[PDB]
Design a protein around this ligand. Sequence first.
Ligand SMILES: [Ca+2]
Ligand SMILES: [K+]
Ligand code: NA
Length: 622
Amino acid sequence: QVNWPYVNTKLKRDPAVEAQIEKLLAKMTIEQKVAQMIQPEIGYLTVEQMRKYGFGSYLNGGNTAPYGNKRADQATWLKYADEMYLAAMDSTLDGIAIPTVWGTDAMHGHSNVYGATLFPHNIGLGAARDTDLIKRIGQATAKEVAATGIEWSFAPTVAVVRDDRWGRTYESYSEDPDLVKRYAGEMVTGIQGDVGADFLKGSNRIATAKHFVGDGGTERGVDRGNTLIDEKGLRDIHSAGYFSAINQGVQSVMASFNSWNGKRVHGDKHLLTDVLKNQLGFDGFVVSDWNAHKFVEGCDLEQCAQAINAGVDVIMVPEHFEAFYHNTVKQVKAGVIAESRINDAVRRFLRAKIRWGVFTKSKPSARPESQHPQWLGAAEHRTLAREAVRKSLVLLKNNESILPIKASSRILVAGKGANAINMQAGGWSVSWQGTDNTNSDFPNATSIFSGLQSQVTKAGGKITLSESGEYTSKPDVAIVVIGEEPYAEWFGDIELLEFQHETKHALALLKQLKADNIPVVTVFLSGRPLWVNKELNASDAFVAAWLPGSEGEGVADVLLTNKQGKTQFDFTGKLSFSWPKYDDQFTLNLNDADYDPLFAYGYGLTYQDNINVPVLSEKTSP
Ligand SMILES: [Ca+2]
Ligand SMILES: [K+]
Ligand code: NA
Protein backbone atom coordinates (compact mmCIF):
# COMPACT_ATOMS: atom_id res chain seq x y z
CA GLN A 1 0.00 0.00 0.00
CA VAL A 2 0.91 3.65 -0.59
CA ASN A 3 1.31 5.81 2.50
CA TRP A 4 0.12 9.41 2.43
CA PRO A 5 1.43 11.97 4.98
CA TYR A 6 -0.70 13.41 7.79
CA VAL A 7 -0.98 17.12 6.95
CA ASN A 8 -3.55 18.63 9.35
CA THR A 9 -0.83 19.70 11.80
CA LYS A 10 -1.80 23.31 12.76
CA LEU A 11 -5.54 23.71 13.30
CA LYS A 12 -6.76 22.50 16.70
CA ARG A 13 -10.47 22.02 17.33
CA ASP A 14 -12.36 24.47 19.57
CA PRO A 15 -13.99 22.54 22.49
CA ALA A 16 -16.78 25.11 22.86
CA VAL A 17 -17.61 24.65 19.17
CA GLU A 18 -17.60 20.85 19.48
CA ALA A 19 -19.87 21.00 22.56
CA GLN A 20 -22.44 23.01 20.58
CA ILE A 21 -22.29 20.57 17.67
CA GLU A 22 -22.84 17.56 19.94
CA LYS A 23 -25.73 19.37 21.66
CA LEU A 24 -27.32 20.27 18.29
CA LEU A 25 -26.86 16.80 16.81
CA ALA A 26 -28.39 15.08 19.85
CA LYS A 27 -31.68 16.89 19.32
CA MET A 28 -31.84 16.79 15.51
CA THR A 29 -34.06 14.50 13.48
CA ILE A 30 -32.86 12.61 10.40
CA GLU A 31 -34.70 15.21 8.29
CA GLN A 32 -32.93 18.16 9.91
CA LYS A 33 -29.57 16.42 9.50
CA VAL A 34 -30.06 15.74 5.79
CA ALA A 35 -31.24 19.34 5.22
CA GLN A 36 -27.81 20.55 6.38
CA MET A 37 -26.15 18.42 3.68
CA ILE A 38 -28.15 19.70 0.67
CA GLN A 39 -27.24 22.81 -1.33
CA PRO A 40 -29.76 24.45 -3.74
CA GLU A 41 -28.80 27.25 -6.15
CA ILE A 42 -30.48 30.70 -6.29
CA GLY A 43 -31.70 30.27 -9.86
CA TYR A 44 -34.08 27.56 -8.61
CA LEU A 45 -34.55 28.24 -4.91
CA THR A 46 -37.40 30.16 -3.29
CA VAL A 47 -37.51 31.73 0.17
CA GLU A 48 -40.54 29.54 0.96
CA GLN A 49 -38.48 26.44 0.22
CA MET A 50 -35.76 27.69 2.57
CA ARG A 51 -38.34 28.25 5.32
CA LYS A 52 -39.77 24.78 4.73
CA TYR A 53 -36.49 22.80 4.68
CA GLY A 54 -33.83 24.97 6.32
CA PHE A 55 -31.03 23.92 3.96
CA GLY A 56 -27.49 24.11 5.37
CA SER A 57 -26.28 26.33 2.56
CA TYR A 58 -27.21 27.75 -0.83
CA LEU A 59 -25.17 28.67 -3.90
CA ASN A 60 -24.55 31.85 -5.86
CA GLY A 61 -24.06 30.12 -9.22
CA GLY A 62 -23.19 33.39 -10.95
CA ASN A 63 -25.60 32.99 -13.85
CA THR A 64 -28.62 34.64 -12.23
CA ALA A 65 -27.86 37.34 -9.60
CA PRO A 66 -30.34 38.05 -6.75
CA TYR A 67 -33.98 38.52 -7.86
CA GLY A 68 -32.97 37.97 -11.49
CA ASN A 69 -31.41 41.43 -11.84
CA LYS A 70 -28.25 41.14 -13.98
CA ARG A 71 -26.53 43.88 -11.98
CA ALA A 72 -27.59 44.74 -8.44
CA ASP A 73 -26.83 47.25 -5.65
CA GLN A 74 -25.23 46.13 -2.36
CA ALA A 75 -28.58 46.69 -0.61
CA THR A 76 -30.20 44.23 -2.98
CA TRP A 77 -27.59 41.53 -2.33
CA LEU A 78 -27.93 42.05 1.43
CA LYS A 79 -31.74 42.03 1.28
CA TYR A 80 -31.64 38.64 -0.41
CA ALA A 81 -29.11 37.34 2.14
CA ASP A 82 -31.32 38.59 5.00
CA GLU A 83 -34.46 36.97 3.53
CA MET A 84 -32.72 33.60 3.26
CA TYR A 85 -31.10 33.97 6.70
CA LEU A 86 -34.45 34.74 8.39
CA ALA A 87 -36.20 31.93 6.52
CA ALA A 88 -33.60 29.52 7.94
CA MET A 89 -33.83 31.01 11.43
CA ASP A 90 -37.56 30.34 11.25
CA SER A 91 -38.11 27.00 13.00
CA THR A 92 -41.83 27.08 12.12
CA LEU A 93 -41.91 24.38 9.44
CA ASP A 94 -38.74 22.30 9.83
CA GLY A 95 -38.60 22.52 13.64
CA ILE A 96 -35.13 24.03 14.15
CA ALA A 97 -33.14 27.29 13.97
CA ILE A 98 -29.80 26.57 12.29
CA PRO A 99 -28.58 29.59 10.27
CA THR A 100 -27.80 28.89 6.61
CA VAL A 101 -24.82 30.26 4.61
CA TRP A 102 -24.34 31.56 1.08
CA GLY A 103 -21.47 30.27 -1.07
CA THR A 104 -19.79 31.42 -4.28
CA ASP A 105 -16.95 30.41 -6.62
CA ALA A 106 -14.07 32.91 -6.62
CA MET A 107 -12.06 32.11 -9.75
CA HIS A 108 -9.87 35.26 -9.78
CA GLY A 109 -11.47 37.57 -7.28
CA HIS A 110 -15.26 37.63 -6.73
CA SER A 111 -15.45 36.97 -10.43
CA ASN A 112 -19.09 36.25 -11.22
CA VAL A 113 -20.23 39.58 -9.72
CA TYR A 114 -20.65 42.70 -11.84
CA GLY A 115 -18.24 45.36 -10.59
CA ALA A 116 -15.75 43.02 -8.87
CA THR A 117 -11.98 43.41 -9.19
CA LEU A 118 -10.66 40.78 -11.62
CA PHE A 119 -7.19 39.52 -10.76
CA PRO A 120 -4.92 37.77 -13.30
CA HIS A 121 -5.92 34.12 -13.75
CA ASN A 122 -3.79 31.59 -11.83
CA ILE A 123 -1.29 30.71 -14.59
CA GLY A 124 0.04 34.28 -14.65
CA LEU A 125 -0.01 34.46 -10.84
CA GLY A 126 2.23 31.37 -11.04
CA ALA A 127 4.62 33.27 -13.33
CA ALA A 128 4.88 36.03 -10.69
CA ARG A 129 6.58 33.75 -8.11
CA ASP A 130 5.34 35.87 -5.19
CA THR A 131 3.72 34.17 -2.19
CA ASP A 132 3.05 37.44 -0.34
CA LEU A 133 1.14 38.71 -3.39
CA ILE A 134 -1.02 35.58 -3.32
CA LYS A 135 -1.88 36.12 0.36
CA ARG A 136 -2.91 39.73 -0.26
CA ILE A 137 -5.10 38.70 -3.21
CA GLY A 138 -6.85 36.28 -0.85
CA GLN A 139 -7.39 39.11 1.65
CA ALA A 140 -8.81 41.41 -1.02
CA THR A 141 -11.00 38.58 -2.29
CA ALA A 142 -12.48 37.92 1.16
CA LYS A 143 -13.50 41.59 1.43
CA GLU A 144 -15.17 41.71 -2.01
CA VAL A 145 -17.04 38.50 -1.18
CA ALA A 146 -18.10 39.88 2.24
CA ALA A 147 -19.43 43.01 0.52
CA THR A 148 -22.12 40.91 -1.19
CA GLY A 149 -23.22 39.19 2.04
CA ILE A 150 -21.56 35.86 1.21
CA GLU A 151 -19.72 33.85 3.90
CA TRP A 152 -18.14 31.06 1.90
CA SER A 153 -15.88 31.31 -1.18
CA PHE A 154 -14.36 28.59 -3.38
CA ALA A 155 -10.60 29.24 -3.68
CA PRO A 156 -7.79 28.33 -4.19
CA THR A 157 -7.70 26.02 -7.19
CA VAL A 158 -4.78 23.66 -6.65
CA ALA A 159 -4.69 21.68 -9.94
CA VAL A 160 -1.21 20.80 -11.25
CA VAL A 161 -1.65 20.75 -15.00
CA ARG A 162 0.39 18.28 -17.08
CA ASP A 163 -1.30 18.55 -20.52
CA ASP A 164 -2.14 22.07 -21.75
CA ARG A 165 -4.83 20.80 -24.10
CA TRP A 166 -7.22 21.02 -21.08
CA GLY A 167 -9.67 23.93 -21.21
CA ARG A 168 -8.99 24.65 -17.51
CA THR A 169 -5.21 25.03 -17.75
CA TYR A 170 -5.32 28.75 -16.87
CA GLU A 171 -6.96 27.97 -13.50
CA SER A 172 -3.71 26.29 -12.36
CA TYR A 173 -0.66 28.15 -11.02
CA SER A 174 1.86 25.73 -12.56
CA GLU A 175 2.80 22.39 -14.11
CA ASP A 176 5.13 22.07 -11.10
CA PRO A 177 3.73 20.62 -7.84
CA ASP A 178 6.34 22.48 -5.72
CA LEU A 179 5.04 25.87 -6.89
CA VAL A 180 1.37 24.96 -6.27
CA LYS A 181 2.31 23.74 -2.74
CA ARG A 182 4.09 27.03 -1.99
CA TYR A 183 1.03 29.00 -3.13
CA ALA A 184 -1.99 27.07 -1.82
CA GLY A 185 -1.58 27.79 1.89
CA GLU A 186 -1.04 31.50 1.24
CA MET A 187 -4.38 31.78 -0.58
CA VAL A 188 -6.12 29.80 2.21
CA THR A 189 -4.73 32.03 4.98
CA GLY A 190 -5.41 35.17 2.94
CA ILE A 191 -9.09 34.24 2.74
CA GLN A 192 -9.64 32.58 6.15
CA GLY A 193 -7.01 34.30 8.26
CA ASP A 194 -4.08 32.49 9.84
CA VAL A 195 -4.68 29.63 12.25
CA GLY A 196 -4.81 31.44 15.58
CA ALA A 197 -6.82 34.21 17.25
CA ASP A 198 -8.03 35.81 13.99
CA PHE A 199 -8.99 32.46 12.39
CA LEU A 200 -12.29 32.90 10.50
CA LYS A 201 -12.93 36.31 12.18
CA GLY A 202 -14.22 39.59 10.75
CA SER A 203 -14.15 39.87 6.97
CA ASN A 204 -12.43 36.46 6.74
CA ARG A 205 -14.45 33.90 4.76
CA ILE A 206 -14.83 30.12 4.85
CA ALA A 207 -12.60 28.75 2.04
CA THR A 208 -12.77 25.71 -0.26
CA ALA A 209 -9.69 24.19 -1.91
CA LYS A 210 -10.50 22.59 -5.28
CA HIS A 211 -10.52 20.07 -6.80
CA PHE A 212 -9.65 16.79 -5.10
CA VAL A 213 -7.98 15.22 -6.99
CA GLY A 214 -6.01 14.79 -10.26
CA ASP A 215 -8.18 16.86 -12.63
CA GLY A 216 -5.02 18.31 -14.17
CA GLY A 217 -3.74 14.87 -15.17
CA THR A 218 -6.45 13.52 -17.47
CA GLU A 219 -5.40 11.64 -20.63
CA ARG A 220 -4.94 14.08 -23.54
CA GLY A 221 -6.18 16.85 -21.23
CA VAL A 222 -9.82 15.93 -21.75
CA ASP A 223 -12.04 17.95 -19.38
CA ARG A 224 -13.60 15.62 -16.74
CA GLY A 225 -11.50 12.93 -18.40
CA ASN A 226 -9.69 9.90 -17.05
CA THR A 227 -6.56 10.29 -14.98
CA LEU A 228 -4.24 7.33 -15.62
CA ILE A 229 -1.57 7.29 -12.95
CA ASP A 230 -0.50 5.09 -10.06
CA GLU A 231 -1.34 6.18 -6.50
CA LYS A 232 2.19 7.40 -5.74
CA GLY A 233 1.98 9.76 -8.75
CA LEU A 234 -1.45 10.97 -7.66
CA ARG A 235 0.17 11.83 -4.30
CA ASP A 236 3.48 13.30 -5.49
CA ILE A 237 2.31 15.27 -8.54
CA HIS A 238 -1.36 16.08 -8.03
CA SER A 239 -1.91 16.47 -4.28
CA ALA A 240 0.89 18.87 -3.29
CA GLY A 241 -1.50 21.83 -3.06
CA TYR A 242 -3.71 19.96 -0.62
CA PHE A 243 -0.78 19.38 1.73
CA SER A 244 -0.39 23.09 2.42
CA ALA A 245 -4.10 23.96 2.17
CA ILE A 246 -5.05 21.31 4.72
CA ASN A 247 -2.08 22.27 6.95
CA GLN A 248 -3.37 25.87 6.93
CA GLY A 249 -6.78 24.65 8.06
CA VAL A 250 -8.87 25.06 4.91
CA GLN A 251 -12.45 24.44 5.97
CA SER A 252 -13.77 22.77 2.84
CA VAL A 253 -12.51 20.59 -0.02
CA MET A 254 -14.36 20.20 -3.34
CA ALA A 255 -14.33 16.78 -5.02
CA SER A 256 -13.29 16.49 -8.69
CA PHE A 257 -15.18 15.75 -11.94
CA ASN A 258 -12.50 13.47 -13.42
CA SER A 259 -12.03 9.73 -13.00
CA TRP A 260 -8.94 8.06 -11.55
CA ASN A 261 -8.01 4.85 -13.36
CA GLY A 262 -11.59 4.52 -14.61
CA LYS A 263 -13.48 5.35 -11.39
CA ARG A 264 -15.28 8.69 -10.83
CA VAL A 265 -13.61 10.49 -7.92
CA HIS A 266 -17.03 11.50 -6.48
CA GLY A 267 -17.84 7.83 -5.81
CA ASP A 268 -14.39 6.77 -4.61
CA LYS A 269 -14.38 6.01 -0.87
CA HIS A 270 -10.65 5.29 -0.97
CA LEU A 271 -9.88 8.85 -2.13
CA LEU A 272 -12.48 10.92 -0.25
CA THR A 273 -12.40 9.04 3.08
CA ASP A 274 -9.34 6.81 3.44
CA VAL A 275 -6.86 9.18 1.80
CA LEU A 276 -8.41 12.62 2.33
CA LYS A 277 -9.93 12.14 5.78
CA ASN A 278 -8.05 9.23 7.41
CA GLN A 279 -4.48 9.59 6.08
CA LEU A 280 -4.20 13.31 5.27
CA GLY A 281 -6.31 14.06 8.33
CA PHE A 282 -8.59 16.75 6.80
CA ASP A 283 -11.02 17.76 9.56
CA GLY A 284 -13.33 19.97 7.47
CA PHE A 285 -16.22 19.17 5.11
CA VAL A 286 -16.25 17.86 1.53
CA VAL A 287 -18.49 19.62 -0.96
CA SER A 288 -19.31 18.09 -4.37
CA ASP A 289 -19.06 19.96 -7.69
CA TRP A 290 -22.05 21.04 -9.85
CA ASN A 291 -24.35 17.97 -10.28
CA ALA A 292 -21.17 15.88 -10.20
CA HIS A 293 -23.09 13.18 -8.31
CA LYS A 294 -25.14 12.34 -11.40
CA PHE A 295 -22.12 10.74 -13.13
CA VAL A 296 -21.40 8.24 -10.35
CA GLU A 297 -22.44 4.63 -11.12
CA GLY A 298 -25.96 3.95 -9.86
CA CYS A 299 -26.66 7.61 -9.10
CA ASP A 300 -28.74 10.25 -10.89
CA LEU A 301 -29.70 13.92 -10.53
CA GLU A 302 -32.13 13.12 -7.68
CA GLN A 303 -30.22 10.43 -5.73
CA CYS A 304 -26.63 9.61 -4.81
CA ALA A 305 -26.03 7.54 -1.66
CA GLN A 306 -22.71 6.33 -3.14
CA ALA A 307 -21.19 9.83 -3.14
CA ILE A 308 -22.41 10.52 0.40
CA ASN A 309 -21.10 7.10 1.51
CA ALA A 310 -17.79 7.81 -0.24
CA GLY A 311 -17.19 10.85 1.95
CA VAL A 312 -19.05 13.79 0.38
CA ASP A 313 -20.59 15.89 3.18
CA VAL A 314 -22.45 18.62 1.25
CA ILE A 315 -24.12 17.91 -2.10
CA MET A 316 -24.20 20.65 -4.77
CA VAL A 317 -27.60 19.92 -6.36
CA PRO A 318 -28.52 23.33 -7.81
CA GLU A 319 -31.87 22.37 -9.36
CA HIS A 320 -33.04 18.96 -8.10
CA PHE A 321 -32.44 19.56 -4.39
CA GLU A 322 -36.01 18.93 -3.19
CA ALA A 323 -36.33 15.46 -4.72
CA PHE A 324 -32.72 14.74 -3.72
CA TYR A 325 -33.57 15.72 -0.12
CA HIS A 326 -36.55 13.36 0.14
CA ASN A 327 -34.69 10.49 -1.57
CA THR A 328 -31.72 10.85 0.77
CA VAL A 329 -34.00 10.75 3.83
CA LYS A 330 -35.61 7.51 2.62
CA GLN A 331 -32.17 6.01 2.07
CA VAL A 332 -31.11 6.80 5.63
CA LYS A 333 -34.35 5.25 6.89
CA ALA A 334 -33.77 2.23 4.63
CA GLY A 335 -30.36 1.96 6.32
CA VAL A 336 -28.28 2.18 3.13
CA ILE A 337 -26.73 5.42 4.39
CA ALA A 338 -25.61 4.97 8.01
CA GLU A 339 -26.77 7.47 10.61
CA SER A 340 -23.12 7.66 11.66
CA ARG A 341 -22.27 8.89 8.13
CA ILE A 342 -24.90 11.67 8.22
CA ASN A 343 -23.73 12.61 11.73
CA ASP A 344 -20.12 12.94 10.58
CA ALA A 345 -21.08 15.07 7.54
CA VAL A 346 -23.11 17.45 9.70
CA ARG A 347 -20.35 17.61 12.35
CA ARG A 348 -17.72 18.60 9.79
CA PHE A 349 -19.99 21.21 8.14
CA LEU A 350 -21.30 22.69 11.42
CA ARG A 351 -17.72 22.83 12.70
CA ALA A 352 -17.13 25.34 9.89
CA LYS A 353 -20.36 27.39 10.17
CA ILE A 354 -20.29 27.58 13.98
CA ARG A 355 -16.60 28.44 14.26
CA TRP A 356 -17.00 31.15 11.60
CA GLY A 357 -19.66 32.68 13.87
CA VAL A 358 -23.07 31.83 12.42
CA PHE A 359 -24.86 31.88 15.83
CA THR A 360 -22.83 34.79 17.21
CA LYS A 361 -23.04 37.28 14.30
CA SER A 362 -26.14 39.31 13.44
CA LYS A 363 -28.19 38.88 10.29
CA PRO A 364 -26.17 39.59 7.08
CA SER A 365 -27.07 43.28 6.42
CA ALA A 366 -26.11 44.22 9.98
CA ARG A 367 -22.70 42.54 10.20
CA PRO A 368 -19.67 44.89 10.34
CA GLU A 369 -18.24 43.38 7.13
CA SER A 370 -21.48 44.31 5.32
CA GLN A 371 -21.09 48.08 5.95
CA HIS A 372 -18.43 48.65 3.27
CA PRO A 373 -19.83 48.64 -0.27
CA GLN A 374 -16.62 50.30 -1.53
CA TRP A 375 -14.84 46.96 -1.00
CA LEU A 376 -16.40 45.64 -4.20
CA GLY A 377 -13.97 46.86 -6.87
CA ALA A 378 -12.05 49.01 -4.37
CA ALA A 379 -9.25 51.21 -5.72
CA GLU A 380 -6.82 49.62 -3.25
CA HIS A 381 -7.69 46.20 -4.74
CA ARG A 382 -7.27 47.41 -8.33
CA THR A 383 -3.84 48.74 -7.36
CA LEU A 384 -3.05 45.24 -6.03
CA ALA A 385 -4.31 43.57 -9.22
CA ARG A 386 -2.27 45.97 -11.35
CA GLU A 387 0.86 44.94 -9.43
CA ALA A 388 -0.07 41.30 -10.09
CA VAL A 389 -0.43 42.06 -13.79
CA ARG A 390 3.09 43.57 -13.92
CA LYS A 391 4.66 40.60 -12.16
CA SER A 392 2.80 38.01 -14.28
CA LEU A 393 4.18 39.10 -17.69
CA VAL A 394 6.89 36.89 -19.18
CA LEU A 395 9.18 38.35 -21.84
CA LEU A 396 9.93 35.55 -24.32
CA LYS A 397 11.73 37.64 -26.97
CA ASN A 398 13.14 41.17 -27.06
CA ASN A 399 15.43 41.43 -30.11
CA GLU A 400 17.78 44.43 -30.23
CA SER A 401 16.15 45.67 -27.00
CA ILE A 402 13.13 47.23 -28.69
CA LEU A 403 11.40 47.06 -25.28
CA PRO A 404 10.94 49.25 -23.28
CA ILE A 405 9.39 51.73 -25.75
CA LYS A 406 9.89 55.47 -25.17
CA ALA A 407 6.49 56.80 -24.02
CA SER A 408 6.92 59.91 -26.19
CA SER A 409 7.03 57.79 -29.39
CA ARG A 410 4.37 57.51 -32.06
CA ILE A 411 2.71 54.17 -31.36
CA LEU A 412 0.15 52.12 -33.27
CA VAL A 413 -1.90 49.62 -31.24
CA ALA A 414 -3.44 46.80 -33.24
CA GLY A 415 -4.85 43.28 -32.94
CA LYS A 416 -8.30 42.06 -31.75
CA GLY A 417 -7.21 42.13 -28.11
CA ALA A 418 -6.07 45.77 -28.11
CA ASN A 419 -9.23 47.23 -26.60
CA ALA A 420 -11.19 44.12 -25.65
CA ILE A 421 -11.42 43.64 -21.88
CA ASN A 422 -13.27 40.37 -22.40
CA MET A 423 -10.17 38.89 -24.11
CA GLN A 424 -7.79 40.07 -21.37
CA ALA A 425 -10.12 38.71 -18.63
CA GLY A 426 -10.83 35.28 -20.12
CA GLY A 427 -13.56 32.94 -18.86
CA TRP A 428 -15.24 33.04 -15.42
CA SER A 429 -15.52 36.83 -15.65
CA VAL A 430 -19.07 38.06 -14.93
CA SER A 431 -20.25 35.37 -17.35
CA TRP A 432 -19.12 31.75 -17.73
CA GLN A 433 -17.47 31.61 -21.19
CA GLY A 434 -16.75 35.32 -21.47
CA THR A 435 -17.81 35.37 -25.15
CA ASP A 436 -20.75 37.79 -24.83
CA ASN A 437 -18.97 40.28 -22.56
CA THR A 438 -18.26 43.78 -23.86
CA ASN A 439 -16.24 46.59 -22.26
CA SER A 440 -19.27 47.99 -20.39
CA ASP A 441 -19.59 44.73 -18.42
CA PHE A 442 -16.39 45.82 -16.66
CA PRO A 443 -16.91 49.28 -15.16
CA ASN A 444 -13.65 50.77 -13.82
CA ALA A 445 -11.52 48.18 -15.64
CA THR A 446 -8.88 49.40 -18.11
CA SER A 447 -8.12 47.86 -21.52
CA ILE A 448 -4.54 47.44 -22.70
CA PHE A 449 -4.99 50.20 -25.28
CA SER A 450 -6.45 52.56 -22.65
CA GLY A 451 -3.53 51.99 -20.29
CA LEU A 452 -1.00 52.66 -23.06
CA GLN A 453 -2.90 55.74 -24.24
CA SER A 454 -2.92 57.25 -20.77
CA GLN A 455 0.87 57.03 -20.41
CA VAL A 456 1.78 57.98 -24.00
CA THR A 457 -0.44 61.08 -23.79
CA LYS A 458 1.14 62.07 -20.45
CA ALA A 459 4.58 61.79 -22.05
CA GLY A 460 3.66 63.83 -25.13
CA GLY A 461 3.73 60.92 -27.56
CA LYS A 462 1.02 59.96 -30.06
CA ILE A 463 -1.11 56.82 -30.14
CA THR A 464 -3.66 55.30 -32.50
CA LEU A 465 -6.01 52.34 -32.12
CA SER A 466 -6.68 50.17 -35.16
CA GLU A 467 -7.33 46.45 -34.73
CA SER A 468 -6.71 45.80 -38.42
CA GLY A 469 -3.44 47.73 -38.35
CA GLU A 470 -4.47 50.71 -40.48
CA TYR A 471 -2.61 54.00 -39.99
CA THR A 472 -2.34 57.54 -41.34
CA SER A 473 1.11 58.49 -40.03
CA LYS A 474 3.54 55.55 -40.06
CA PRO A 475 4.30 54.66 -36.43
CA ASP A 476 7.71 54.15 -34.78
CA VAL A 477 6.46 50.85 -33.35
CA ALA A 478 3.34 48.68 -33.43
CA ILE A 479 2.09 47.00 -30.27
CA VAL A 480 -0.03 44.10 -31.46
CA VAL A 481 -2.39 42.55 -28.89
CA ILE A 482 -3.54 39.08 -29.98
CA GLY A 483 -4.55 35.77 -28.42
CA GLU A 484 -7.13 33.15 -27.55
CA GLU A 485 -10.82 33.98 -27.33
CA PRO A 486 -12.18 33.54 -23.78
CA TYR A 487 -13.40 30.09 -22.69
CA ALA A 488 -14.27 27.97 -19.64
CA GLU A 489 -14.07 24.21 -19.04
CA TRP A 490 -14.55 21.83 -21.99
CA PHE A 491 -15.22 24.69 -24.46
CA GLY A 492 -11.47 25.32 -24.18
CA ASP A 493 -10.31 21.73 -24.74
CA ILE A 494 -8.10 21.59 -27.87
CA GLU A 495 -6.40 18.89 -29.96
CA LEU A 496 -3.80 21.01 -31.79
CA LEU A 497 -1.11 23.19 -30.20
CA GLU A 498 -0.72 25.65 -33.08
CA PHE A 499 -2.22 29.08 -32.40
CA GLN A 500 -5.20 29.82 -34.71
CA HIS A 501 -4.36 26.72 -36.75
CA GLU A 502 -7.46 27.09 -38.93
CA THR A 503 -7.12 30.78 -39.87
CA LYS A 504 -3.72 32.21 -38.87
CA HIS A 505 -5.48 35.61 -38.81
CA ALA A 506 -3.13 37.23 -36.29
CA LEU A 507 -0.04 36.05 -38.23
CA ALA A 508 -1.26 37.85 -41.39
CA LEU A 509 -1.57 41.07 -39.38
CA LEU A 510 1.97 40.63 -38.00
CA LYS A 511 3.47 39.95 -41.43
CA GLN A 512 1.60 42.91 -42.93
CA LEU A 513 3.29 45.21 -40.42
CA LYS A 514 6.74 43.59 -40.96
CA ALA A 515 6.45 43.97 -44.75
CA ASP A 516 6.02 47.69 -44.09
CA ASN A 517 9.25 47.66 -42.11
CA ILE A 518 7.39 48.59 -38.91
CA PRO A 519 8.94 47.21 -35.70
CA VAL A 520 6.53 44.84 -33.91
CA VAL A 521 5.94 44.14 -30.21
CA THR A 522 3.47 41.29 -29.72
CA VAL A 523 1.39 41.05 -26.55
CA PHE A 524 -0.05 37.53 -26.41
CA LEU A 525 -3.21 36.80 -24.35
CA SER A 526 -3.73 33.13 -23.55
CA GLY A 527 -4.58 30.66 -20.84
CA ARG A 528 -1.57 28.47 -21.66
CA PRO A 529 1.57 28.21 -23.78
CA LEU A 530 0.77 27.46 -27.43
CA TRP A 531 2.96 26.65 -30.45
CA VAL A 532 3.67 30.12 -31.86
CA ASN A 533 6.98 29.81 -33.78
CA LYS A 534 5.52 31.58 -36.81
CA GLU A 535 4.14 34.51 -34.79
CA LEU A 536 7.41 34.73 -32.88
CA ASN A 537 9.34 34.99 -36.17
CA ALA A 538 7.08 37.88 -37.22
CA SER A 539 7.75 39.73 -33.94
CA ASP A 540 10.73 41.76 -32.73
CA ALA A 541 9.54 41.34 -29.16
CA PHE A 542 6.96 38.92 -27.79
CA VAL A 543 5.34 39.03 -24.36
CA ALA A 544 3.28 36.26 -22.73
CA ALA A 545 0.64 38.24 -20.80
CA TRP A 546 -1.66 35.29 -19.95
CA LEU A 547 -5.11 36.49 -18.82
CA PRO A 548 -4.24 39.61 -16.81
CA GLY A 549 -7.78 40.54 -15.70
CA SER A 550 -9.30 43.99 -15.21
CA GLU A 551 -6.09 46.02 -14.76
CA GLY A 552 -4.75 46.40 -18.31
CA GLU A 553 -2.48 49.33 -17.41
CA GLY A 554 -0.06 46.90 -15.79
CA VAL A 555 1.01 46.12 -19.35
CA ALA A 556 1.89 49.76 -20.11
CA ASP A 557 3.71 49.97 -16.75
CA VAL A 558 6.28 47.44 -17.98
CA LEU A 559 6.47 47.91 -21.77
CA LEU A 560 6.79 51.73 -21.69
CA THR A 561 9.43 54.05 -20.25
CA ASN A 562 8.34 56.93 -18.03
CA LYS A 563 8.11 60.47 -19.46
CA GLN A 564 11.83 60.97 -18.77
CA GLY A 565 12.59 58.00 -21.05
CA LYS A 566 13.78 55.75 -18.20
CA THR A 567 12.65 52.24 -17.28
CA GLN A 568 9.74 52.33 -14.82
CA PHE A 569 9.18 48.62 -14.24
CA ASP A 570 11.27 45.71 -15.52
CA PHE A 571 9.95 42.22 -16.25
CA THR A 572 10.13 39.83 -13.28
CA GLY A 573 7.87 36.96 -14.35
CA LYS A 574 9.23 33.49 -15.15
CA LEU A 575 7.43 30.64 -16.92
CA SER A 576 5.47 28.32 -14.61
CA PHE A 577 4.54 26.18 -17.64
CA SER A 578 7.04 24.92 -20.26
CA TRP A 579 6.77 26.49 -23.73
CA PRO A 580 6.64 24.05 -26.69
CA LYS A 581 9.19 23.99 -29.54
CA TYR A 582 7.08 21.70 -31.76
CA ASP A 583 3.34 21.61 -32.35
CA ASP A 584 3.07 18.08 -30.86
CA GLN A 585 4.80 18.52 -27.50
CA PHE A 586 1.58 17.88 -25.60
CA THR A 587 3.02 16.78 -22.27
CA LEU A 588 6.14 18.89 -21.87
CA ASN A 589 6.95 19.14 -18.18
CA LEU A 590 9.82 20.20 -15.93
CA ASN A 591 11.93 17.14 -14.94
CA ASP A 592 10.74 14.99 -17.87
CA ALA A 593 13.30 12.46 -19.14
CA ASP A 594 13.11 13.84 -22.66
CA TYR A 595 12.82 17.57 -22.02
CA ASP A 596 13.33 19.71 -25.10
CA PRO A 597 11.31 22.95 -24.68
CA LEU A 598 11.56 26.16 -26.73
CA PHE A 599 11.59 28.06 -23.41
CA ALA A 600 12.04 26.09 -20.20
CA TYR A 601 10.20 26.30 -16.88
CA GLY A 602 11.78 29.26 -15.10
CA TYR A 603 12.67 31.12 -18.30
CA GLY A 604 12.03 34.84 -18.57
CA LEU A 605 14.04 37.67 -20.11
CA THR A 606 14.51 41.05 -18.49
CA TYR A 607 15.75 44.45 -19.66
CA GLN A 608 19.15 43.57 -18.16
CA ASP A 609 19.59 40.80 -20.74
CA ASN A 610 20.98 41.39 -24.23
CA ILE A 611 19.81 38.16 -25.82
CA ASN A 612 18.42 37.75 -29.34
CA VAL A 613 16.08 34.95 -30.38
CA PRO A 614 16.96 33.69 -33.89
CA VAL A 615 14.46 32.74 -36.59
CA LEU A 616 12.71 29.52 -35.54
CA SER A 617 11.63 26.48 -37.53
CA GLU A 618 8.05 26.79 -38.81
CA LYS A 619 7.69 23.13 -39.74
CA THR A 620 4.53 21.47 -38.40
CA SER A 621 3.95 17.73 -37.88
CA PRO A 622 1.88 15.88 -40.55
CA1 LIG B 1 3.73 21.37 -19.26
K1 LIG C 1 -25.03 7.60 -13.27
NA1 NA D 1 -35.09 26.06 10.07
